[PDB]
Symmetry: C4
Subunit: 388 residues, 4 copies
Amino acid sequence: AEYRNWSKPQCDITGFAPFSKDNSIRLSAGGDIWVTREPYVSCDPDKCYQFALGQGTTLNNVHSNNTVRDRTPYRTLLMNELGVPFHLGTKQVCIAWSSSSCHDGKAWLHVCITGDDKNATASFIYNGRLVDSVVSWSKEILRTQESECVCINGTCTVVMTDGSASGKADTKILFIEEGKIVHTSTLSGSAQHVEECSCYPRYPGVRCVCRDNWKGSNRPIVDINIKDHSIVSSYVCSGLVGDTPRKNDSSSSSHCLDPNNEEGGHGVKGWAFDDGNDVWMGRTINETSRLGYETFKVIEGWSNPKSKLQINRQVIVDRGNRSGYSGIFSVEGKSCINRCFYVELIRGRKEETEVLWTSNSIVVFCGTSGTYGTGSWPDGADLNLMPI
Amino acid sequence: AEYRNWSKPQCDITGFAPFSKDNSIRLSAGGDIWVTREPYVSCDPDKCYQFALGQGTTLNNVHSNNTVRDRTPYRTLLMNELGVPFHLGTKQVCIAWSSSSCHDGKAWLHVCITGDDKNATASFIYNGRLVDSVVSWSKEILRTQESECVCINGTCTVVMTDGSASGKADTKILFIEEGKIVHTSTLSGSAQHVEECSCYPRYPGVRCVCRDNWKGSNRPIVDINIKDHSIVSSYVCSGLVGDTPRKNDSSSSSHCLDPNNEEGGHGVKGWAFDDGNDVWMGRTINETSRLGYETFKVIEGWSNPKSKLQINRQVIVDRGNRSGYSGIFSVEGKSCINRCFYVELIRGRKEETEVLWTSNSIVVFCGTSGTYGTGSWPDGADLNLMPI
Amino acid sequence: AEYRNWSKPQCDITGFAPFSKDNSIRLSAGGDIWVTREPYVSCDPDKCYQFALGQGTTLNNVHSNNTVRDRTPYRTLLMNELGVPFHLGTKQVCIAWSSSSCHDGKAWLHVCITGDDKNATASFIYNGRLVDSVVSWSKEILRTQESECVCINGTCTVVMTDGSASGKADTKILFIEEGKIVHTSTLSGSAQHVEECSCYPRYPGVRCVCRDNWKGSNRPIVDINIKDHSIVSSYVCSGLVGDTPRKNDSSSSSHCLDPNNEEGGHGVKGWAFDDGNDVWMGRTINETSRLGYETFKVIEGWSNPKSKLQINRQVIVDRGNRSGYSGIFSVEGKSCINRCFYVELIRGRKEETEVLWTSNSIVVFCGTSGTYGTGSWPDGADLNLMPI
Amino acid sequence: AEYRNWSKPQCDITGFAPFSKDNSIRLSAGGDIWVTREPYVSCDPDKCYQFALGQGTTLNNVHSNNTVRDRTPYRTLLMNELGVPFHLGTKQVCIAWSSSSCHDGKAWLHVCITGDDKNATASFIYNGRLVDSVVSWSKEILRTQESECVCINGTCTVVMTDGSASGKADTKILFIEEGKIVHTSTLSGSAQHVEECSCYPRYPGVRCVCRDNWKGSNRPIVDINIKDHSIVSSYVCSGLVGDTPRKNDSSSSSHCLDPNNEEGGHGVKGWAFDDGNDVWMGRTINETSRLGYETFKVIEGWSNPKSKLQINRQVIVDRGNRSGYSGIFSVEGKSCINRCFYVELIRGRKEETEVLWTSNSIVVFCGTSGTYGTGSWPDGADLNLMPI
Ligand SMILES: *[C@@H]1O[C@H](CO)[C@@H](O[C@@H]2O[C@H](CO)[C@@H](O[C@@H]3O[C@H](CO[C@H]4O[C@H](CO)[C@@H](O)[C@H](O)[C@@H]4O)[C@@H](O)[C@H](O[C@H]4O[C@H](CO)[C@@H](O)[C@H](O)[C@@H]4O)[C@@H]3O)[C@H](O)[C@H]2NC(C)=O)[C@H](O)[C@H]1NC(C)=O
Ligand SMILES: *[C@@H]1O[C@H](CO)[C@@H](O[C@@H]2O[C@H](CO)[C@@H](O[C@@H]3O[C@H](CO[C@H]4O[C@H](CO)[C@@H](O)[C@H](O)[C@@H]4O)[C@@H](O)[C@H](O[C@H]4O[C@H](CO)[C@@H](O)[C@H](O)[C@@H]4O)[C@@H]3O)[C@H](O)[C@H]2NC(C)=O)[C@H](O)[C@H]1NC(C)=O
Ligand SMILES: *[C@@H]1O[C@H](CO)[C@@H](O[C@@H]2O[C@H](CO)[C@@H](O[C@@H]3O[C@H](CO[C@H]4O[C@H](CO)[C@@H](O)[C@H](O)[C@@H]4O)[C@@H](O)[C@H](O[C@H]4O[C@H](CO)[C@@H](O)[C@H](O)[C@@H]4O)[C@@H]3O)[C@H](O)[C@H]2NC(C)=O)[C@H](O)[C@H]1NC(C)=O
Ligand SMILES: *[C@@H]1O[C@H](CO)[C@@H](O[C@@H]2O[C@H](CO)[C@@H](O[C@@H]3O[C@H](CO[C@H]4O[C@H](CO)[C@@H](O)[C@H](O)[C@@H]4O)[C@@H](O)[C@H](O[C@H]4O[C@H](CO)[C@@H](O)[C@H](O)[C@@H]4O)[C@@H]3O)[C@H](O)[C@H]2NC(C)=O)[C@H](O)[C@H]1NC(C)=O
Ligand SMILES: CC(=O)N[C@H]1[C@H]([C@H](O)[C@H](O)CO)O[C@@](O)(C(=O)O)C[C@@H]1O
Ligand SMILES: CC(=O)N[C@H]1[C@H]([C@H](O)[C@H](O)CO)O[C@@](O)(C(=O)O)C[C@@H]1O
Ligand SMILES: CC(=O)N[C@H]1[C@H]([C@H](O)[C@H](O)CO)O[C@@](O)(C(=O)O)C[C@@H]1O
Ligand SMILES: CC(=O)N[C@H]1[C@H]([C@H](O)[C@H](O)CO)O[C@@](O)(C(=O)O)C[C@@H]1O
Ligand SMILES: *[C@@H]1O[C@H](CO)[C@@H](O)[C@H](O)[C@H]1NC(C)=O
Ligand SMILES: *[C@@H]1O[C@H](CO)[C@@H](O)[C@H](O)[C@H]1NC(C)=O
Ligand SMILES: *[C@@H]1O[C@H](CO)[C@@H](O)[C@H](O)[C@H]1NC(C)=O
Ligand SMILES: *[C@@H]1O[C@H](CO)[C@@H](O)[C@H](O)[C@H]1NC(C)=O
Ligand SMILES: *[C@@H]1O[C@H](CO)[C@@H](O)[C@H](O)[C@H]1NC(C)=O
Ligand SMILES: *[C@@H]1O[C@H](CO)[C@@H](O)[C@H](O)[C@H]1NC(C)=O
Ligand SMILES: *[C@@H]1O[C@H](CO)[C@@H](O)[C@H](O)[C@H]1NC(C)=O
Ligand SMILES: *[C@@H]1O[C@H](CO)[C@@H](O)[C@H](O)[C@H]1NC(C)=O
Ligand SMILES: *[C@@H]1O[C@H](CO)[C@@H](O)[C@H](O)[C@H]1NC(C)=O
Ligand SMILES: *[C@@H]1O[C@H](CO)[C@@H](O)[C@H](O)[C@H]1NC(C)=O
Ligand SMILES: *[C@@H]1O[C@H](CO)[C@@H](O)[C@H](O)[C@H]1NC(C)=O
Ligand SMILES: [Ca+2]
Ligand SMILES: [Ca+2]
Ligand SMILES: [Ca+2]
Ligand SMILES: [Ca+2]
Ligand SMILES: [Ca+2]
Ligand SMILES: [Ca+2]
Ligand SMILES: [Ca+2]
Ligand SMILES: [Ca+2]
């Protein structure tokens, strides 16, 4: 067993093909399924796994009431093989109301964060054992990616944030080798607010596309150099923007270096990646809320902040159905690295009031150099019928 | 680990011995079992698995209502080891309302089809990753085998159909090597309508026995040449015919080259295989509907369309109990290749109205060169008692 | 991986120590557990498994009504690792209302019998595939061991019976090599009626201690020679006898060669093994019915039909609690072969009428050359409270 | 696969980071979870497992009533990978109302005790088979560690106690090699009462920190020499004491050699370990009962019975929430041996009367040479809502 290097060029993408769907919430109307959120997908050399943060409870269960909250002591990182819904035999791999996970080609890394809001602890677990931890540095909700970290030659990188949600915060980028925090670089460059990055291996380094919760509706970009720990940062040029909330297609604008100050308060976790000078990206179809989900390629979208020339649109979830967080993950094909993505289908409170709980199901698509058609893959649960 | 070649002669068959039964529906009266259909069985070099398409729901569950439908976004290919009923820890290995699966002796292939009726996508997943996809070519319900594909020397073949259900349609035969669609041959020969093939390794090529939904009640045969991609096609000569609906034993007839225009509208998935100039085949005992299931050998049945000389009958399911889809699968013994088959035991709507759902259990028999007796292995569930 | 030979002397036994208990029925009052009977335990080179025959249903489930019956089409051989109760993820490894299983040191053998009473089929499954089958030869309930078969140098032996339950029947001993029935020897010697043998590896052959349902209350012994297929048979000399029903300790008697004609009608599956000229054996404490369970060593019990000198008694289940079938199984220690045994704890109909079902839990003890004390390990379920 | 030696120095500890939480009881309000107690955590070379003693029942289940009792025939040692809550597919690895488990780097050892109070049997299971057993020697509740044993060079040591709960009892230390009891040393030294030791590998021997149920509120220490079987014993010097009940921080005192006769009746299982001349230790925050849980380092606490100078306090469970048993376990890092600990969160009778049952959930922390913050990780179940 050797360390992953990801030293392959990126596969040709013409769009995305269906990969996986757990129908979690549909199943939880007759069956004992976890109540969860902030899910993600990472894979080892052999196969793929689905992670989410649990609420220390199942759905048909009295403790599902008020699971609209983001941080409780009862939240754990859940881990199943992709396709297995989160049943009672699901492994809680750590305590976490915030996490990131990745395989370096030998073993698993989990970055797990739990504890008081003003004094969170984050634990680094490698190969089934605790190897390190770190305190919250700025004592205001130390949090991280809510999707996969990335490892290269057995140095793993993760991006974490401690500080304000709607002002300046303190973002750091850790380098972890066999569970051991070996360097901490601090956030540098033109990125102003940075959360919940969706990172991927762009050999010989790592690239993330994040969430600015403060002044931007364009997504931040952070570039991690694995060998020398240097950091550069910016935003996704593309005049069509991926955060939510945002302005409309005609009224929106962006900058390659700055927040665009366009509805920038708040955000949603999301992803994009480059392709020469083009950008592939998903986002919620609806501009103000987490409804629907779409993907497309912005031509010149990576290097030109004026371009709003989208091609290869795909409706992942239709505009009248509920969506949420999404993030990248990358799978080594035989010649090249594929890029894929998951979509959190949030059901329940506060937006839907027919029940007392908040939970999700997931959907997953992978890059394809072949061809594809159309559809919609919503949650599919009937909340009017659900465990009353 | 080496590629399967199947370069062994076919085992002597004198009939079939019991192999497996999941009692799925009986179990779902006290327990959380998937609602499913269009099931099948394929095996790796070591052991066997049971696949079916799910309805994104369990049985005792409000979302089981109206699962009589064939295509929803919530359907996934389920996969367990043979014998394990489809419980909540069951792996949904892809999104699919139509699928085929096979092992090449190194890894798994899944051919998974989902999306809009008029624009379906089909995804090719090998060794835990998406390697290819293709659009529906004729924009009318691109669909496939609903049983195992076949691989030889690590080229896998699958047969798909896009087009009319009760007229001419467009049938293709894909060649897939490590998940990668490497050739597409188009349907050629005297076969007129072709769906849901039950294929098997007849070294050095592949043979399928299909369903003609249009003008035939005899089953079509398609012969895939793996090395040169050439296709030939026809029908099962045997004057005793395997599709359902059909005419009776005295009134029926067949042709080696053409549909017989005998009740040919509609069909049911089914299987047959050759044995010198004889044909082994199963079918529903009842001629117009999916009740009972039987097997027999038609003497001269492979090469003589006038012969109705059956020997070695076996009642798999008695005529007063419900049956359905069946298909072949092949298992490498030590000296030879065995042929086996599964039978879908459909319960529920529309035919049975004591409940709101449609689901199945399965039964499985394997070829034997030994001896056997008699019985019946129906579903065994009491719908009058079932989750009301 | 090499073939088991069992070419080690038998471990010193001074009695038995607790090994395993599944509390199956207690668990089935809040949880979905299989309804089962005729259970057993066999182990591979590494670890042990618990088998039973299912009723195609769980306990809290409408199909549990009338599971007092012995042969339905819905019965399957269940297989879990020892300690795991029979939950919904339990593998049904074949169709069977009668079975035997054993590992030859490379793979699993299952001998599975199902079908019409007057025409049963028995299927031989090795290494995940059907390799052979045989018809019922005398068309009256072909049945077998309901405990582990035994393999030596990769020839496996199993004993089967077709014929009368309360008169002469036809007993055969099959030799199976890699799933393939390679010889059939027929029952020879002074044994008159022979069923449900508990066999074990007494190198260089195999020994069984059976159930005579006709004229004996002493258990039959059958000696299988693996290399030359010759058979000899008799009864357990010991003046203290192991079948149930039987006469009392003072009124009982036995013969080394013949049934003792003492309450001999009926029986119960049970076990014994030799130790120089002594016999270790378990039996129901109660003489007429399946209540309590005990073990002891009869001094001179193996070769002397007049001896009723028991030592080293142990109450496995107390006399006021329900017991049932028991059988041997053998585990290779490092220097020697241990002998162990399981006990079926039957609850329900017909004997207990507070419920509608019939099911069991199990308890397991293993030989010890160390020391031990006392207790009782009954089922422990409250039928007055159970799923009404 | 080689024998564990643990021949590494002990990792630097600055305190403890979160590791694991099963939310067992929260899950059991909608789902079938075991009712359990006296849990623990041990790990093989690769990964960690959570053990507890079951009550032969689930929570929502009629047999959960009166599970306040410590010894029934229906109790088994449960074993899952750490993080998996005790669901119906959980392996009961032996019969036990008292147990200890450990891996020697090749296979598992379980020391399992069950049977009559006045004649208990204890079974030694190694590598999936019974290798030895021993009777209770003093016929008064032979019991053991309720946490992991320790093995070095493939000799495993376990400490057991038979005798009085509130007076002199008979404590022994067994040496077990491949399941085989190879030596028994008897308790020697100044320790007066000794139960439920939390042992760990302090190369070249083993150290335990126990529970004195009689005259001490300071914890006993027992030092096992693996090569020569010699035993020495004493108490934890530290003027801040770890048993419960006890006196307060100002009123308490201790001795390095004797019980302190301070509220010494009763106890609770607990742990401590050394660090030069300092002691790390956890205990219940509340002095008289099992509420809250805390950890700290007593400076000079290992060798100085007058020192009450605590540093590096951490609240594991807050003082208004329920705690219970805790014990050490040790994980081999790459350079050094980490020390971790679990905490039993007991809910139910007798202390809480809103339900009829007694059960637990667990929480687990591991040593860290990094940094950490604060929180509380209580059970989190609402007994006022629980399965009525
Ligand atoms: C079966 O399946 C396929 C795959 O999903 C569908 O084909 C895709 O259709 C979509 C939707 O039209 C295409 O995405 C769109 O591309 C447009 C490009 O405009 C033209 O200009 C270029 C010049 O380079 C031409 O090459 C090209 O042929 C186009 O004619 C964009 O302008 C679109 O964006 C706009 O449309 C949507 C509204 O739908 C708005 O929401 C946007 O804001 C914006 O105004 C869009 O991105 C996609 O490229 C096609 N894919 C492929 C691979 O060809 C089929 O349509 C589908 N069939 C059926 C019946 O459903
Ligand atoms: C115990 O188990 C075995 C195995 O299942 C049964 O034996 C089988 O019995 C079936 C049913 O009769 C046999 O299948 C039939 O074969 C007939 C052959 O006709 C004769 O001619 C040949 C000449 O070559 C002779 O060799 C042979 O002995 C026959 O006498 C077919 O004509 C049958 O088809 C017709 O029968 C059925 C009605 O049952 C109709 O539905 C058909 O449409 C058609 O009219 C049939 O195929 C089978 O061959 C036997 N198997 C074996 C291996 O010998 C036993 O019968 C069973 N015992 C009991 C008591 O149930
Ligand atoms: C703690 O645990 C141990 C192990 O279970 C118990 O010790 C066992 O006790 C049983 C029950 O008495 C013993 O089994 C009995 O052996 C008797 C032998 O008789 C004597 O003669 C021999 C001469 O060779 C002496 O060596 C020996 O010491 C005996 O004194 C049999 O006669 C018994 O059979 C009769 O008793 C039972 C009634 O209990 C009847 O049901 C029978 O039908 C029959 O009449 C019996 O088999 C066993 O040998 C002991 N085992 C060991 C290893 O020593 C302890 O008793 C137990 N302690 C407590 C307090 O429960
Ligand atoms: C964020 O997270 C960290 C880690 O949990 C917290 O820092 C820890 O705080 C605790 C609680 O105060 C510290 O533990 C305490 O240490 C005291 C040492 O006293 C002083 O003297 C030494 C001299 O060597 C100085 O080095 C040191 O700075 C101290 O000022 C003990 O006296 C304490 O024991 C007493 O306090 C508690 C009450 O809380 C009583 O229950 C005891 O009985 C006793 O009277 C205590 O042990 C710990 O050392 C700190 N850890 C680290 C790594 O620095 C932060 O406080 C937290 N931040 C927030 C806002 O919550
Ligand atoms: C660690 C944590 O609490 N993460 C939470 C974040 C933060 O609130 C923002 O990132 C603030 O910066 O976002 C959510 O509220 C959201 O948008 O769905 C949910 C998520 O649980
Ligand atoms: C992809 C798809 O919809 N397959 C369906 C087919 C098609 O309707 C026919 O093959 C039309 O050609 O058959 C069924 O209706 C049937 O007969 O049970 C069910 C199955 O789901
Ligand atoms: C194959 C079969 O039916 N086996 C059954 C046997 C037979 O009735 C006798 O062995 C008749 O010879 O015994 C039982 O009735 C019994 O005693 O509990 C149950 C078991 O299911
Ligand atoms: C084997 C056994 O019964 N162990 C029990 C011990 C003993 O009672 C004491 O150690 C007496 O010495 O402690 C408990 O009561 C307790 O404190 O929670 C529970 C545990 O089940
Ligand atoms: C659910 O939680 C809310 C928030 O605490 C509370 O007001 C309400 O009473 C709860 N309702 C039920 C039915 O549990
Ligand atoms: C990975 O890192 C090691 C450091 O020891 C180095 O020797 C090796 O050459 C590196 N490999 C690549 C492919 O960069
Ligand atoms: C976006 O979501 C809100 C949900 O309340 C809805 O009212 C609004 O119409 C949606 N907007 C668009 C443009 O679809
Ligand atoms: C079931 O579905 C049908 C079809 O939509 C609908 O008319 C009916 O109301 C549903 N019934 C129930 C009880 O859910
Ligand atoms: C299988 O295909 C490869 C192509 O590289 C060929 O070299 C090999 O000989 C083939 N094997 C057989 C048995 O046909
Ligand atoms: C076939 O099935 C239908 C079901 O409605 C039944 O009415 C008919 O009698 C059956 N025919 C035969 C020949 O068994
Ligand atoms: C149970 O089965 C018996 C035997 O057929 C039948 O008479 C009875 O009505 C059944 N009772 C219930 C409640 O299902
Ligand atoms: C087992 O059987 C084989 C037959 O090929 C023989 O060669 C071998 O010596 C036998 N081994 C033993 C230990 O009897
Ligand atoms: C044996 O069992 C029956 C059960 O009905 C009971 O009535 C009888 O008293 C028992 N006999 C003995 C000797 O324990
Ligand atoms: C629970 O157990 C107690 C103790 O035996 C008993 O008195 C009580 O009746 C039981 N209650 C219920 C509801 O089962
Ligand atoms: C300890 O626990 C008991 C529980 O009844 C409580 O009444 C008491 O106040 C607690 N004491 C302290 C010092 O927290
Ligand atoms: Ca349930
Ligand atoms: Ca924003
Ligand atoms: Ca349920
Ligand atoms: Ca047709
Ligand atoms: Ca249930
Ligand atoms: Ca008898
Ligand atoms: Ca339930
Ligand atoms: Ca004490």
